[PDB]
């Protein structure tokens, strides 16, 4: 067996919430979440929530993880798709996901470039490792049912594991999306903090945070560059800039239907007609990054 | 602000004054892209081709990182203020090698690996100075003595003269295989010549000596096998037969051929169509197979 390190091997997993939620586009749905868990200490390092299963959540949650913690020397990514249980998450959404169109690229290809070795099973034969996911469901994504779904605040929207659950009945009962997200962030934070962890590392004494704080300090990581991060963002189809240095984006799809116009001095006087926008849905209402049709970074266009 | 070996690399293209009979028979003047370590002045890699295209950059870059690793703070310079690198930074038609290639963009590849590109010759914000040297002998231009002016290429040497059609050189043209061989030797001689009168060398050491000395200090990371394959050219999907083998109609700027590759793993998988990542140079030996969606499958050898 090869020595394992904090951040050295992370396991990806999804989770369907047993809580009805009124999403940003008025739809009442059962939110789906993708987590990135540190295999060695079990701490949850990042996640992204959306109306359904889609690569964007994997892509952007990966970005949060590497941005916050850095890239280890021997980085290992696991997305156990044995039965094909990840086939839904790995399918690209329809370009009009947010009304405005996106460029068909592939995050899987981006992870490899960054230095991540991908695995589509539960073991890492080459290292002799094999428990990507923990034994006790409590330490895996299933353990998050008690901190989020069961959370008091979500008591009215909770549905339980009823496969055939009528959204129609939950119209007036749905919890506010912004509230759910807040609850989610707190749920996760508590999972990572609970003491009395029945694991080997913790030895029924420490919390996942305790062992991660300890082990992570022994690790050597590099922090991604400015560009490495932006490339992990989504590429919007070239929008034609006007002479005044502004452009519009009809934000629809799964997001709050809006019509944002971004402006940035440089854009104007600079010799540019069309620009390629690189964004993150969660910041779309605030900032976006502009690039020429050839790829050169033009500027950081703010909203108006 | 002390610069380290491998920290700042400068790329520059060179147009040869020697007529060569390429693999596709065409007698042309070969273009080459060089990567040079700004600190020590040592040439780290190059790629030769019929014209000027982004492929040579993408592949020469892969050779450099595969050999020396990726340092912590990596800077890459391609001065295009005078319009110089204009043609190099353009791709060829997808049928440049006969079969079709996907329209990727290597510029985006360099960034995802941690490189910081600059389109000028000075690295803004650091007291390093400029990429291109003063004494032109220490640059790409000093390769004329060791390559173009090589005795072995005397018949095809056109010397400096923009106006010079293949005309006289229909049969005077030196064969590609010999050129490339002479190229590799020239570059190695450039790097080995001692008494280099630079600050670093002090009219005593050679570019090689100083690089060995300085590079020993640089902390780098070797790229993974996947990072390396992702730098290779993406071919359009082909139909893998049930026998676990497929065809690649090589041509265009390369000698025509109908190569057949094979690998058992292809039968065991339910793969009908496979994506091929190749290196023009290794097409006659190996190719890398990837699932239509992006999952590595295996290395198919050439039959």
Curated annotation (Swiss-Prot), chain A:
Q: Where is the short sequence motif DDE located? A: 13-136
* Coiled-coil segments: none
In residue numbers, the region (Target DNA capture and bending) covers 235-304
Q: Which positions in this protein are listed as binding Mg(2+)?
A: 13, 80, 136
Q: Where in the cell is it found?
A: Host cytoplasm
Report residue spans for region: Catalytic.
1-234
Q: What is the effect of changing residue 136 to A?
A: Complete loss of both the DNA cleavage and joining activities without bloing tetramer assembly
Induction details? Expressed in the early phase of the viral replicative cycle. Expression of early genes is repressed by viral Repc (latency) and favored by viral Ner protein.
Miscellaneous field: This enzyme is structurally similar to and performs the same endonucleotidic reaction as retroviral integrases, RNase H, RuvC holliday resolvases and RAG proteins.
Q: Subunit structure, briefly?
A: Homotetramer. Part of the transpososome complex composed of a DDE-recombinase A tetramer synapsing the ends of the viral genome and the enhancer element. Interacts with target DNA activator B; this interaction brings DDE-recombinase A to the transposition target site. Interacts with host ClpX; this interaction remodels the transpososome for replication and is required for the flaps endonuclease activity of DDE-recombinase A.
Family according to the record: Belongs to the mulikevirus repressor c protein family.
Present the record's domain note: The catalytic domain contains two distinct activities, the cleavage and strand transfer activity and the flaps endonuclease activity. The N-terminal HTH Mu-type domain 1-alpha is responsible for sequence-specific DNA binding to the IAS. Two adjacent regions 1-beta and 1-gamma bind to the ends of the viral genome.
Q: What does this protein do?
A: Responsible for viral genome integration into the host chromosome. During integration of the incoming virus, DDE-recombinase A cleaves both viral DNA ends and the resulting 3'-OH perform a nucleophilic attack of the host DNA. The 5' flanking DNA attached to the ends of the viral genome (flaps) are resected by the DDE-recombinase A endonuclease activity, with the help of host chaperone ClpX. The gaps created in the host chromosome by the viral genome insertion are repaired by the host primary machinery for double-strand break repair. Responsible for replication of the viral genome by replicative transposition. During replicative transposition, DDE-recombinase A is part of the transpososome complex. DDE-recombinase A cleaves the viral DNA and the resulting 3'-OH performs a nucleophilic attack of the host DNA. The 5' flanking DNA is not resected and an intermediary structure is formed. This structure is resolved by target-primed replication leading to two copies of the viral genome (the original one and the copied one).
Q: What is this protein called?
A: DDE-recombinase A
Gene field: A
User: Which residues of the parent protein does this chain contain?
Assistant: 257 to 560 of 663
